[PDB]
Amino acid sequence: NYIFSSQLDKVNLILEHMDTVGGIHSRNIAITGDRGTGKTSFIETLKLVLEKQNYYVFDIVSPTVLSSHLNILEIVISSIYREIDQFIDVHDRGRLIQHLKKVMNAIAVEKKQSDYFKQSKPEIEMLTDLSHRTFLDEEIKELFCYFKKVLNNRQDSCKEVIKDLVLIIDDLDLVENNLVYDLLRDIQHYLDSQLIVIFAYKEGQLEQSMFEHLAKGNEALLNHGVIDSNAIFGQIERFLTKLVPLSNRIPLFKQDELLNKTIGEFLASLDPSYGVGENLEFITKDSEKNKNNLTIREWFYESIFYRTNLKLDPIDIREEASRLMPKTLREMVQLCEELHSMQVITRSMDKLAGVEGLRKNIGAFRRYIGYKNSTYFNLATMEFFQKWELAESHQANYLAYHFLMSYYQESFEQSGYPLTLRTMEPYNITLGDIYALMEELKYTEGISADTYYIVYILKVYYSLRLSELLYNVVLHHKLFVHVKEEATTFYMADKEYREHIMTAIEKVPALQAYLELVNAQFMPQNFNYDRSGSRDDDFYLISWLKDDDLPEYSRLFKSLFLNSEVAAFRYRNLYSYLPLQLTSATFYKIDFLAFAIKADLLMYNVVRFVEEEGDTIPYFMSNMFHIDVFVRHNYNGKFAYIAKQIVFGLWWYKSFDTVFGTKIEALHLLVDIAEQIKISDEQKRDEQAK
Amino acid sequence: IDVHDRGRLIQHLKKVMNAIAVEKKQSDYFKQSKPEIEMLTDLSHRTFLDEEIKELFCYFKKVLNNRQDSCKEVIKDLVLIIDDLDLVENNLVYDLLRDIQHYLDSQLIVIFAYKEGQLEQSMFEHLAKGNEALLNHGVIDSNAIFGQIERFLTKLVPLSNRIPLFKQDELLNKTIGEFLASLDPSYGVGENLEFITKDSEKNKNNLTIREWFYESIFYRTNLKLDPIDIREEASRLMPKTLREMVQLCEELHSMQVITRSMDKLAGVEGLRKNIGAFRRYIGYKNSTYFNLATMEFFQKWELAESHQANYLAYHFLMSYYQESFEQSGYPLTLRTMEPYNITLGDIYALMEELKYTEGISADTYYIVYILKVYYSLRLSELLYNVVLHHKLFVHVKEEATTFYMADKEYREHIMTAI
Amino acid sequence: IFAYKEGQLEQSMFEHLAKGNEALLNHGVIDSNAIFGQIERFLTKLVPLSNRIPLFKQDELLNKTIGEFLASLDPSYGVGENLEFITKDSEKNKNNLTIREWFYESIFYRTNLK
């Protein structure tokens, strides 16, 4: 099941069409696309096909051969001489040698080498040498005719007569630019109607190489406005039309049909037995549980998942994620090589040992992203991402905000609250403002294209760092099992509790770094949870008057929705993801999705995830595309329904899949608390969440 | 000193040398009026250089295998390593890359040992002058050239074959103990941040290089230079590479580290010296992003006597403030102000206002940090020089006691002592 | 032992690398920072910063006393109370004025100008 079969059949059809005409006609072929990589490269395979059809194929002209600085005629005659010297005809060999000498004279004459250009007193007979160059067409024709005759005379048992000589110039995709121009002319002048020349270039390299020469050939025409680029491009157009008829040019395998096919077909192209199993690991025998018909496009994401526990397929397709997957077959093979096992995380065993390898796969994928993300980056974005990496754990948000604002400004000249945080502390940015600014930039009456992919890559980098920090925290789960227990005691029914939480935080630097990344809010602090009109009148503000009058379970309504302790004045944290001690008669703003990122609740969830082995997994804020899903959620007596959505409704949504569990809880302790309510007074989970 | 295979190796070496000469337009083919037929063989040696090189390396491996005694084992492959490519005359490495593409791509195991994106930039330097008229007429952009380079390097070195190691991130994240063990298992840092050898058992080797840097600048300069505001980009000083880390340890190993023993009196004299040494180290580190205004400013600030320095610092910081105003405040109203009317509180106030200005960022923050560090160094140096000459004014202390324990002679005496 | 001044090495390296990086700098692929970092690490490896020794700029030159400099030329040289150069002992000399204000005090006594 050769994968370029159609192209090979078309080549053979072209060769068929031209074989009928034998009157010294111009016939050339131009192969374009990704004809390369491991062992099914179209060029060698085509050469072999031509060999068994009685076409004599010159040894492939590689960039190594072209780097010799010899013209294609010199290469061809050297190959002819070597071929005839390989064996030891007489009658035709001597004529072949005479024509070779004549061609070498013509080459020397063109090089202004002969005595004609170096003698004061020209003689008559050297004028013959000049003729050898002015009649080079006939000499070359006779040379190739006699070469074919000599080759036919070395065939044993009278196999068959050779049809024609074929010259292939491989790996022309990148040969010193102007050099290929020198090649083209050489083919136009000496080997146009002499052989079957196969070019094997890419896209519009020929046109650009011709333009590079003609433009310096047309300075004074272009600057005086006599001609424009259109005239030069038309010249090149008709030249290439005559050199290679557009019915003789064959494209193959760009990115479109590369991404559209199935992973199974590509793996078969490498070997019939290779496949991908249900854990997106590369399999060999049969499995019968394999998933080989997913197409490379979404196989890419489904297989990044199961290795990084990150669903990186964006809800918004404006983000140009397809700029990562493969771009060519070589990149596809190399991606498979980098990404084949990396200790793929499966759905077996006790769902505990897959965390250590997961952060490693995160690092490897970050390296792969950096390799991919090194082309369109110019200077500001390499700089920004580099500084963002080594931004400790808390200056990164400030840098990201100001970088995104730099993008915002680049379209403002041609007020908004998310745009009013430049004279803002690094500890007053959080992650919700980053996402809010990226959305506002996604909806700005300005620049596009590159900006969208910059936003996507920033989201990917943030997700990678968040997952890495979360997994580092999970590795050090023992150090704070106790606080989980305490948290249970603390809001199952003060100040030592906060003290303990801070002590436990200090002993795990990774937990610090994670909580500092998501300072206190991964959702925009503007978000409308009620899609009925505007945002609110006084909906998101509370008072919290005094402890002696707070109702039961009030500690829950301080760490679930109430991530700040301020009146709602310069050097102020304003967020304090730690347990909060609120004063009397003060307005406080509510954020419905703060539970997952509070220190005590996060560590409760971490210990629950590591210790308990059932079927649920606590929700962890490790992916910003989770925020993409969150902003898309409906959320709609009013407060109760929104709270239930936070607790139960939220748990598009395939980005919450996780490699460790089937479903996702929000905070298991809310279940136990619900139990106590039953004492004081899917259906069961719904009723408790209510 | 084989015979059977050496002669073939020599023949292939001669063929390769011919091919090289032919590529150099050296042979008689390019210098003779009247070409002969057999020199066309020499051209072939260059048009078939791949096969000649393959045979050469095959026979070289055979000859090397024939010199093994006691039949140890057969050689697997030939490996070529090109070290210290991080900085080789730019375009020269391009000439190397092509040479590897043309002659040694599928012949050996080539190890490149370069840094970051040096290869891409070196290729671009050549392709850009190769694509003048394409770029200026708008036919192509940098993206096309970068894609060309991208796929070329993808084929030359598969991205599964490239290995990075030890940038600054994991360099700063590890512990000082691990690095010192990387130098020698017995080296460590004691509780006074001095380098120890035996065991101590009071050592602090798990502090990480990041804050070990500051904790060890302290105990030598008596200066806590870790900034409360992390916007200030102090991490631009600590190390940047392992070589810089080793050299920092070399410069900063004892410098008569000030301990918590004895009578806390003799550590002042060495403290100002360590201040000077650290100022030198800062100047060495702080010589890259500085362009012309800041070298100038800091130089003048040094030799600003002892009182024009504040004026210079204020006007330099105001220069930074202005560079973002076009795109009233009281701290900004001191340019037509005497040098003796600036003080140090206005310098700090202006640096804070610049830290909170709706304008430029990045470099400005680190400039503020370095100015603060320089001021702290000068203040500590002057304070310690004063402390050295403490006897000369013991009497005034006593007088001060008498003076506000309960006039005009008192002021007179204070001025004389000053 | 190199015996150069200030940042001559960095500037000399930049003069070469900049013409080595025309098309990188004009197309915005790199800035002066990259070239300066290259030079920085090259010079860091060539001469460790623990191996470089500075001496006697203008700061400590102006801070010392005229007597110390004159002793650096010859132990007996000094400056008298009229700011004239003396040799024997005077015992009325003023050698501890520092070069900074000795400069002005000695322009005075010759031009009658403070």
Author numbering:
A (entry chain F): 28 to 115, 119 to 444, 457 to 535, 556 to 630, 645 to 712, 718 to 732, 745 to 774, 786 to 794
B (entry chain G): 115, 119 to 444, 457 to 535, 556 to 567
C (entry chain C): 228 to 341
Verbatim from the authors:
The RADAR system comprises two genes, rdrA that encodes a protein with an ATPase domain, and rdrB, encoding a predicted adenosine deaminase domain protein. Here, we determine cryo-EM structures of the RADAR defense complex, revealing RdrA as a heptameric, two-layered AAA+ ATPase and RdrB as a dodecameric, hollow complex with twelve surface-exposed deaminase active sites. RdrA and RdrB join to form a giant assembly up to 10 MDa, with RdrA docked as a funnel over the RdrB active site. Our results define ATP mononucleotide deamination as a determinant of RADAR immunity and reveal supramolecular assembly of a nucleotide-modifying machine as a mechanism of anti-phage defense.
To better understand the RdrA C-terminal domain, we next determined a 2.5 Å cryo-EM structure of the divergent (<20% amino acid identity) RdrA from Streptococcus suis. S. suis RdrA adopts a similar two-layered heptameric architecture confirming conservation of the C-terminal α-helical lobe despite high sequence variability. Interestingly, S. suis RdrA particles existed primarily as 14-mer complexes with the RdrA stacked head-to-tail. In this conformation, although the ATPase domains are highly similar (RMSD 2.7 Å), the final four α helices of the RdrA C terminus undergo a dramatic ∼120° reorientation relative to the E. coli RdrA structure and flip out to form a protein-protein binding interface.
